[PDB]
Amino acid sequence: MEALVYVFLLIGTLVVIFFAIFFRDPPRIA
Amino acid sequence: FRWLAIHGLAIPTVFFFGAITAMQFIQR
Amino acid sequence: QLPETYNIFAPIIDIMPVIPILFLLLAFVWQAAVGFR
Amino acid sequence: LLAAALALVAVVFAVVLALFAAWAA
Amino acid sequence: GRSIESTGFAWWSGNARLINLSGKLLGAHVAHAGLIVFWTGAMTLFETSHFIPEKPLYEQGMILLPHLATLGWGVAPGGEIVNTYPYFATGVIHLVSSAVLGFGGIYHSIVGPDVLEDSFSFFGYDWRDKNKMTTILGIHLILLGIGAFLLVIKALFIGGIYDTWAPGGGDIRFITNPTLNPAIIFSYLLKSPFGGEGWIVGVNNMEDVIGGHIWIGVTCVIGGIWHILTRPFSWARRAFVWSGEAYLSYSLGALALMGQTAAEYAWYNNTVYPSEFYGPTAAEASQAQAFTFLVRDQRLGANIASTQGPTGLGKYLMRSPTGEVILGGETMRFWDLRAPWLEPLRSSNGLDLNKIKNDIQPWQERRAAEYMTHAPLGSLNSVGGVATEINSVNYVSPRSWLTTSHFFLGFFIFIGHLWHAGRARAAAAGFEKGINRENEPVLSMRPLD
Amino acid sequence: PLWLVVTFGGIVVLTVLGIFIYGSYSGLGSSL
Amino acid sequence: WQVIVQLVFLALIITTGPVIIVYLSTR
Amino acid sequence: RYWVIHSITIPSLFIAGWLFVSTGLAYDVFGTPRPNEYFSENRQQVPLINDRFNAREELDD
Amino acid sequence: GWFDLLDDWLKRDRFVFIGWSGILLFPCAYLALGAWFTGTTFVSSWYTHGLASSYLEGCNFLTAAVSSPANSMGHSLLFLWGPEAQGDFTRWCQIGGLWTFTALHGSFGLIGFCLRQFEIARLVGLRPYNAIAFSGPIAVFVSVFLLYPLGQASWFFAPSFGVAAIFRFLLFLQGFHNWTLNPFHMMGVAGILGGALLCAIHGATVENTLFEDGEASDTFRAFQSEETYSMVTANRFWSQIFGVAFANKRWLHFFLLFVPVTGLWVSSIGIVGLALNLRAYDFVSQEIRAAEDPEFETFYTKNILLNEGIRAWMAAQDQPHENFVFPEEVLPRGNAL
Amino acid sequence: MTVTLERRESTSLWERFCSWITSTENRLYIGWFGVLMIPCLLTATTVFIIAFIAAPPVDIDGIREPVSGSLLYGNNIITGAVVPTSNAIGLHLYPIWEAASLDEWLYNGGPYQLVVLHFLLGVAAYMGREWELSYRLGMRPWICVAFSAPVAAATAVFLIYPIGQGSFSDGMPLGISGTFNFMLVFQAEHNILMHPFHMAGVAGVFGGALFSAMHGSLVTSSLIRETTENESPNYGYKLGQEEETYNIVAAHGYFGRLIFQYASFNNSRALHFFLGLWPVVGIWLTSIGISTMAFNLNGLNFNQSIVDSQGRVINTWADIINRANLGIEVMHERNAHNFPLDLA
Amino acid sequence: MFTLKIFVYSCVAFFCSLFIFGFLSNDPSRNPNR
Numbered sequence A: 001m002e003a004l005v006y007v008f009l010l011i012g013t014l015v016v017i018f019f020a021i022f023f024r025d026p027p028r029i030a
Numbered sequence B: 001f002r003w004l005a006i007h008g009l010a011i012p013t014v015f016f017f018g019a020i021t022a023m024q025f026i027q028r
Numbered sequence C: 001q002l003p004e005t006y007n008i009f010a011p012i013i014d015i016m017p018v019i020p021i022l023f024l025l026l027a028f029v030w031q032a033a034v035g036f037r
Numbered sequence D: 001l002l003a004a005a006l007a008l009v010a011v012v013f014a015v016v017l018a019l020f021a022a023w024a025a
Numbered sequence E: 001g002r003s004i005e006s007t008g009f010a011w012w013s014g015n016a017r018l019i020n021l022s023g024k025l026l027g028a029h030v031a032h033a034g035l036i037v038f039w040t041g042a043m044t045l046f047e048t049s050h051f052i053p054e055k056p057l058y059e060q061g062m063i064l065l066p067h068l069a070t071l072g073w074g075v076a077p078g079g080e081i082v083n084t085y086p087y088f089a090t091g092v093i094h095l096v097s098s099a100v101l102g103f104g105g106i107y108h109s110i111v112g113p114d115v116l117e118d119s120f121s122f123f124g125y126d127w128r129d130k131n132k133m134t135t136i137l138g139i140h141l142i143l144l145g146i147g148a149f150l151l152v153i154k155a156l157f158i159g160g161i162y163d164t165w166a167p168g169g170g171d172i173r174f175i176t177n178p179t180l181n182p183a184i185i186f187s188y189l190l191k192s193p194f195g196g197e198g199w200i201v202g203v204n205n206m207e208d209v210i211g212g213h214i215w216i217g218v219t220c221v222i223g224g225i226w227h228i229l230t231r232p233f234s235w236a237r238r239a240f241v242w243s244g245e246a247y248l249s250y251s252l253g254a255l256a257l258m259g260q261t262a263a264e265y266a267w268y269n270n271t272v273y274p275s276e277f278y279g280p281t282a283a284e285a286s287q288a289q290a291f292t293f294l295v296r297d298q299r300l301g302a303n304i305a306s307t308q309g310p311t312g313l314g315k316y317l318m319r320s321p322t323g324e325v326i327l328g329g330e331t332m333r334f335w336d337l338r339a340p341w342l343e344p345l346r347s348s349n350g351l352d353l354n355k356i357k358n359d360i361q362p363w364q365e366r367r368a369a370e371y372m373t374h375a376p377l378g379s380l381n382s383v384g385g386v387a388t389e390i391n392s393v394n395y396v397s398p399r400s401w402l403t404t405s406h407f408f409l410g411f412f413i414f415i416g417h418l419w420h421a422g423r424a425r426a427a428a429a430g431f432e433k434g435i436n437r438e439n440e441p442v443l444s445m446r447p448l449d
Numbered sequence F: 001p002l003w004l005v006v007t008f009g010g011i012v013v014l015t016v017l018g019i020f021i022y023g024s025y026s027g028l029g030s031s032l
Numbered sequence G: 001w002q003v004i005v006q007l008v009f010l011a012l013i014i015t016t017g018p019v020i021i022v023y024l025s026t027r
Numbered sequence H: 001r002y003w004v005i006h007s008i009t010i011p012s013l014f015i016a017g018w019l020f021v022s023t024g025l026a027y028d029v030f031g032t033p034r035p036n037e038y039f040s041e042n043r044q045q046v047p048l049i050n051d052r053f054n055a056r057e058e059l060d061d
Numbered sequence I: 001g002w003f004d005l006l007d008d009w010l011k012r013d014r015f016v017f018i019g020w021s022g023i024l025l026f027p028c029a030y031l032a033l034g035a036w037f038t039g040t041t042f043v044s045s046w047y048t049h050g051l052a053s054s055y056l057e058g059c060n061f062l063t064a065a066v067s068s069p070a071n072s073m074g075h076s077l078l079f080l081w082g083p084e085a086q087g088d089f090t091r092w093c094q095i096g097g098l099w100t101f102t103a104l105h106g107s108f109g110l111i112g113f114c115l116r117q118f119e120i121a122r123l124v125g126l127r128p129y130n131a132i133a134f135s136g137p138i139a140v141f142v143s144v145f146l147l148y149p150l151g152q153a154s155w156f157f158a159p160s161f162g163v164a165a166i167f168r169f170l171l172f173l174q175g176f177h178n179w180t181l182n183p184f185h186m187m188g189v190a191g192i193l194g195g196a197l198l199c200a201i202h203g204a205t206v207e208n209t210l211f212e213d214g215e216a217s218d219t220f221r222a223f224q225s226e227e228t229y230s231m232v233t234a235n236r237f238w239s240q241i242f243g244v245a246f247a248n249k250r251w252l253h254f255f256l257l258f259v260p261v262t263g264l265w266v267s268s269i270g271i272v273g274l275a276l277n278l279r280a281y282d283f284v285s286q287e288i289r290a291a292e293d294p295e296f297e298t299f300y301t302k303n304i305l306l307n308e309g310i311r312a313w314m315a316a317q318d319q320p321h322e323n324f325v326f327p328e329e330v331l332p333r334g335n336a337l
Numbered sequence J: 001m002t003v004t005l006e007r008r009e010s011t012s013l014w015e016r017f018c019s020w021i022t023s024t025e026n027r028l029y030i031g032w033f034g035v036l037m038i039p040c041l042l043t044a045t046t047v048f049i050i051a052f053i054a055a056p057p058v059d060i061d062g063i064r065e066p067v068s069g070s071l072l073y074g075n076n077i078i079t080g081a082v083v084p085t086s087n088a089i090g091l092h093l094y095p096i097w098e099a100a101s102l103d104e105w106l107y108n109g110g111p112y113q114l115v116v117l118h119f120l121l122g123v124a125a126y127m128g129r130e131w132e133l134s135y136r137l138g139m140r141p142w143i144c145v146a147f148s149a150p151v152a153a154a155t156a157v158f159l160i161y162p163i164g165q166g167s168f169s170d171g172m173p174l175g176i177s178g179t180f181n182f183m184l185v186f187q188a189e190h191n192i193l194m195h196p197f198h199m200a201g202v203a204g205v206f207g208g209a210l211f212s213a214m215h216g217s218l219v220t221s222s223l224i225r226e227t228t229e230n231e232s233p234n235y236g237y238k239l240g241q242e243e244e245t246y247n248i249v250a251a252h253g254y255f256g257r258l259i260f261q262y263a264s265f266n267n268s269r270a271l272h273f274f275l276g277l278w279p280v281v282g283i284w285l286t287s288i289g290i291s292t293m294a295f296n297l298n299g300l301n302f303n304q305s306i307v308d309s310q311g312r313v314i315n316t317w318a319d320i321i322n323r324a325n326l327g328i329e330v331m332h333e334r335n336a337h338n339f340p341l342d343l344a
Numbered sequence K: 001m002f003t004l005k006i007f008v009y010s011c012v013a014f015f016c017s018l019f020i021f022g023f024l025s026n027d028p029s030r031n032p033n034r
Ligand code: CLA
Pocket: C021, E011, E012, E013, E014, E015, E016, E017, E248, E252, E412, E413, E414, E415, E416, E417, E419, E423
């Protein structure tokens, strides 16, 4: 059941991406 | 160094070009 | 082949289709002659 | 194949087409 | 203006200097047409000059002569090129005409007036004049219709066209009864482009071809008249960008699409592109190999309808996913093939096993051998065969040249379409030269988060 | 003239390259 | 002997371009 | 002005390379086989070098 | 002073900068490049690989090369005055001395060029990031052209300086090492493709967020401390398109330094691995499963088969010194083909 | 009356919809091209994930020998893939509703066709979307061209090549190992390495990475001291500032002394144009190469081109690479071929 | 299977109609310089 680990890692990456997009700290103009 | 470099590249280039043309006419 | 008459015009025809390319190249020549390119 | 497909396609298309026609008016 | 200072464009983008100069632009177009007709003539005379009587066209690297042969000039029954003189005639005509168009081009480009709106009013135009543009469009559309009717006339009355499906092998035939039924023609139009369907590339009889050209002729003429005598509706006026570059981009998209379509015609169709002239298709060649070894092994005493391959599928004969009896092996992918040398053996449920056992003709075997040995595979330096093949056969099928070249062209033409459409939008709105430092849109927008 | 020099030189280069391309069809390396 | 004819014709066309340009460059 | 010495040396070098090939001196210099020297009357196989420290005597044969 | 005068002369502002680094760089660079031309034009590989290798023999630019030394030479440095050629230039070329010549002079040439980057950087007064970035390519050359053959039997299996020859090295490493399956190589591919991506996207973005600093359609002429493009507009655009955008120019430029360079370094790790035949060739789990279960198939196993084919057939021609004889009955192949 | 018809249509419902669709205030821009893109990419993504994890083996070569591609069927990340549709289907449209059951669909490789078509559509729409947002924000519109290069590549390996070869089974597998397989077979049957357009592609990516590293190193080298020691120099730049953050003259000078004076760029606009142009053209050409080789105009064939006086073949490196090509050719799809020539 | 076809056809026709009629709604006017 290495499939569990692979799925876990993939879900991890996708979650990281999701939070990188919708939970980024907003860029602020000088 | 300008002369040395420019000629360093250009002289053999012409030599080789002649050679290779000559090769274009070598038959089996 | 070509009709026997125009047989004598074989080599010239061999160069005929290469002419449009020359025109392209000519453009650059023209430009270089002017001062641009 | 069946008439149902054409019916639905033409239905949705006509609906959005009318929406657009109102907009154009 | 012919400088960066006077126009704003550099010597490269040099050609953009002609956008608002009607005269020189017309000169450019005419001269270019001159180049096209030049190439047509010169290359045709080249192909006639290099042609050898007792060899197939596709072995000699011909792409123009197969078109003329398809139209029915100098062809004997079977696809034998006997008379090579009409080709010479067309080549000469095109060449001389190229002299005329060339003269006109150089004149309007260098000698004549830059602006045709001053001295003239019929040949002058503003890009923003919708009526004039639709008028020109209408005229040229009518011209295209006339051309379609030229093909129709040529095929109905003047000798006819080469029919590879002709009852008795490929032969020139006058199309007596063309197809005018809208159900059929437009059945082509509204059909899938996928396997077994083929959209408009799947046309397999000259009746439907010529009838289709009747329909397209009528359509182009009626549309030409329509655009000449009308003005664009409100919605079209609101939806489109009205400028020269925009029109250029539209024609570019169109020509990209057409390029792709032509590549597909050259690659799959063998009716408008007879295999006698253009060579076999990939499908046709693969099927030809399967057929060939089916015949060979059947002659060696094998019951091919019962011959089990390594996989468990038929070695020579199997079934298509919809039940039809087809040739086995990889060529199972090519079971949609229709070829005049194979259809004699075709039945209602696919290949007729009885006819396969009994009625296979020598000429069919010759066709299969020839085609499987002239498959459209070859290197860039024209080494015939698969990539691992050795240097002996000098051959690359005309189908490969045509299809690849026109994919190249269609592709880059699409790129040009994106480029010019984008620049058309940006130039219309007014920011094609950069962002206004005093009117930067983003600075007037609420931040994203 | 600079442009005439560039043109002549370019023609020369293209001629030599053309000779090489011809050489791919003749003599050694031509499969003949 | 056909090759020489071909190369002569080629030379003439190729030269034809630049000659027109040079000629007009004088005027 | 500087085209003279170049008109006397550039063609000279060009012809010198040409002669370097046409006289066949290149073959003798770089040990490159002539189109008729790949296989002799004695050897019909590829003449690979097998001895590292005796490559001279091996190449002589 | 003497040394000070030397330094003054060497660091003069010429059309081509020299420097101390120039003392090392220019000779070796010249000799490497020249050896490549000399070899690809005149020298053959008949006595090393049994191959024609030069223009003189009929090779074109694609098939010509300076091939690796004979396998029998081992890891010999193959000096011209070495105990193998013994001064004889002809026998030297026939052995494959030009390969070691090109390789060593090329190596010291790379050292000299990197030192040149450092030197010019220090003289001008810049940060030496160009040299570091260049440590990348160096790692590639050292690992592939030096370490890999040094780990193997001889220089013979090192890449030959030529197009089709390099292609051979490629397919060789695929068939024998399953190099595509190696994660380090995958990181390399990530580095290169990512680098090209960054180059393209940065170029396009800057070109399409330009400020109107002129009236001409030729925006090139209209170019100072002011930014020539709108960073804010770019940020907005890529944030709404891709979800994430750059905000810091310095971080951006460092990033498109970092990605490709890292790629190169990683793939180098991989290549060292292959120098010792320490491959990422197989997945034991799938090999065992496939051994016990004849219905189990993945693209991995298919590629394993492909490797086996490559190895047989080419094995006979690519390694002539081995005298491999494979009867046509033992060559692995499928039905019909 | 000029080019653009500058006019509005008075807070209509359809106009409100068009406004929201084309809104530049949305966190993610959803243009009309997005009206196409979002559903396509979502369907494609869902089917891809579900299949990559749990899809049963697929009879790719139509020879009734199903290949396993999913994780729950013995694959890992590297070997797992979405197996291309059956060669028995070829270029036939095979939607779910044309199969008798989902099981059949899974067996014949329907997922691949679905995912490929939807993905290509959605990615084309992605390109159009890049243009669209560029237009809405008053930008120059040529980012989508740059992106047109990768789209062309994807279209080449997922659509055009199957068209030229007559089957989606020849399309590139959606997976790592499958990709490698695609590459190897492609080399065997087109000799792509000896194709000048692929060489152009390699020039595009190698050169792209080179110029990326070069530009990066140059700008990073000439950063102006705005930061303290041991602190991140990135903090020395602020988003939106107008002052340049590096010494362009110093960089140009360095580059000028590295090679020679006239080898360096002075115009940053020219430099970045070049940076955008080189790899995009490279990739364009390689994409074209994949498609034109999709119609069997293969790479340069120099097999046995060199002959000796007696008439015997003298091999070159092209012959060796031909040996490798032969290996791949004879070994690939061992049970698929019944006849001596591989024409499909 | 037919109902699925009907569903998918409905979706495709829907989004295609929105696309076409959407891009017909004076799109060139949708720019910051208007
Ligand atoms: C219907 C065809 C068509 C027409 C009429 C135009 C017309 C125009 N284009 Mg355009 N374009 C087209 C197709 C077309 N394009 C295609 C298919 C593409 C995609 C490749 C482009 C990409 C393009 C760009 C990127 C740009 C233009 C621009 C322009 C404008 C100036 C062009 C110019 O000066 O050329 C100058 C001509 C040259 C410099 C010659 C270049 C030759 C190329 C690079 C090599 C092609 C290889 C060739 C096939 C053979 C190789 C030679 C070999 C034998 C030695 C002008 C309005 C410019 C613009 O927007 O200005 C408003 C601009 O920047 N075009």
